[PDB]
Amino acid sequence: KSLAKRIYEAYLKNFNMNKVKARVILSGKASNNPPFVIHDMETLCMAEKTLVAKLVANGIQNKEAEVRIFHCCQCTSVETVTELTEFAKAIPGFANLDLNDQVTLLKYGVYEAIFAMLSSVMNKDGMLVAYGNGFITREFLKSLRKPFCDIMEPKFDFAMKFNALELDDSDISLFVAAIICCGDRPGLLNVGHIEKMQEGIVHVLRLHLQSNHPDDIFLFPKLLQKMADLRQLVTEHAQLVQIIKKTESDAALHPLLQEIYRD
Ligand SMILES: Cc1cccc(Nc2cc(Cl)nc(SCC(=O)O)n2)c1C
Ligand SMILES: Cc1cccc(Nc2cc(Cl)nc(SCC(=O)O)n2)c1C
């Protein structure tokens, strides 16, 4: 409970979007600057005009939507990986890890953490983008050509099963820290120091859930399973991005993300 509060602090401090902010928009007004809704190329075109005006002047609307939606995804992945880094530095004992240990835990935990947190900004109909000023629909996303249609569906699939657990952000902050401090990660130099960390977070997490959701007895074991799915989800996800990199003409990877995929 003592450790929990600081992780819940670091969580709120370091992420521009959270479940409360996201439901505020997904649930309704949001009376000022309401999300643009994106269901087709026309509204996609409308949103770019408003939001990324510099790009539109640069001629991006000549490119197919599959590629602009994909480059939009990378930019957000890059925003979040930066936020995930600053968040980890605020988890106790993380800064004290050897720097190669710090670099390693983040290489493997971020896409798992990204996908878990993505669930907070989704409902069955769609997901928020552009810092809450855009809402792109799941169906427009399925409308897109292969392999581009295949990226978001597995994550929408998880989000509904995940959002159904009805976690609050205090839950999610401990959950995201635990993903990060996994000691099973390859290439670690000081595994005991790190396993020692995971042992701590998971205790407070087991304890917070017990208090936060006294009614849901099976919630904790259910969450541990959620961690395994994300690894597979991330593994399958990686397989898809490799297919796109070798295959699609304008699917350039961002350099930061390219560092993530080296192993
Ligand atoms: C969902 C959404 C909201 C706002 C703008 C856009 N269009 C974008 C966004 C980004 Cl980050 N990049 C592009 S094209 C980039 C390039 O020429 O490499 N197009 C999109 C796809
Ligand atoms: C918070 C948020 C909302 C929407 C999209 C994303 N980034 C994603 C999500 C998914 Cl399922 N796929 C991609 S493709 C490029 C990449 O490998 O980061 N990018 C993120 C990080």
From Swiss-Prot:
GO terms for cellular component: chromatin; nucleoplasm; nucleus. Changing L167R: Abolishes heterodimerization with RXRA. No DNA binding. Keywords: Activator, Biological rhythms, DNA-binding, Lipid-binding, Metal-binding, Nucleus, Receptor, Transcription, Transcription regulation, Ubl conjugation, Zinc, Zinc-finger. Indeglitazar binds at S77, Y111, Y261. Ubiquitinated by E3 ubiquitin-protein ligase HUWE1; leading to proteasomal degradation. Changing L188R: Abolishes heterodimerization with RXRA. No DNA binding. Induction: Down-regulated by aging. Skeletal muscle, liver, heart and kidney. Expressed in monocytes. The keyword Zinc-finger applies. Residues 101-230 are annotated as: Required for heterodimerization with RXRA. GO terms for biological process: behavioral response to nicotine; cell differentiation; cellular response to fructose stimulus; cellular response to starvation; circadian regulation of gene expression; enamel mineralization; epidermis development; fatty acid metabolic process. Its main location: nucleus. Ligand-activated transcription factor. Key regulator of lipid metabolism. Activated by the endogenous ligand 1-palmitoyl-2-oleoyl-sn-glycerol-3-phosphocholine (16:0/18:1-GPC). Activated by oleylethanolamide, a naturally occurring lipid that regulates satiety. Receptor for peroxisome proliferators such as hypolipidemic drugs and fatty acids. Regulates the peroxisomal beta-oxidation pathway of fatty acids. Functions as a transcription activator for the ACOX1 and P450 genes. Transactivation activity requires heterodimerization with RXRA and is antagonized by NR2C2. This is Peroxisome proliferator-activated receptor alpha. It comes from Homo sapiens (Human). The gene is PPARA. The chain holds residues 204 to 466 of 468 of the full protein.
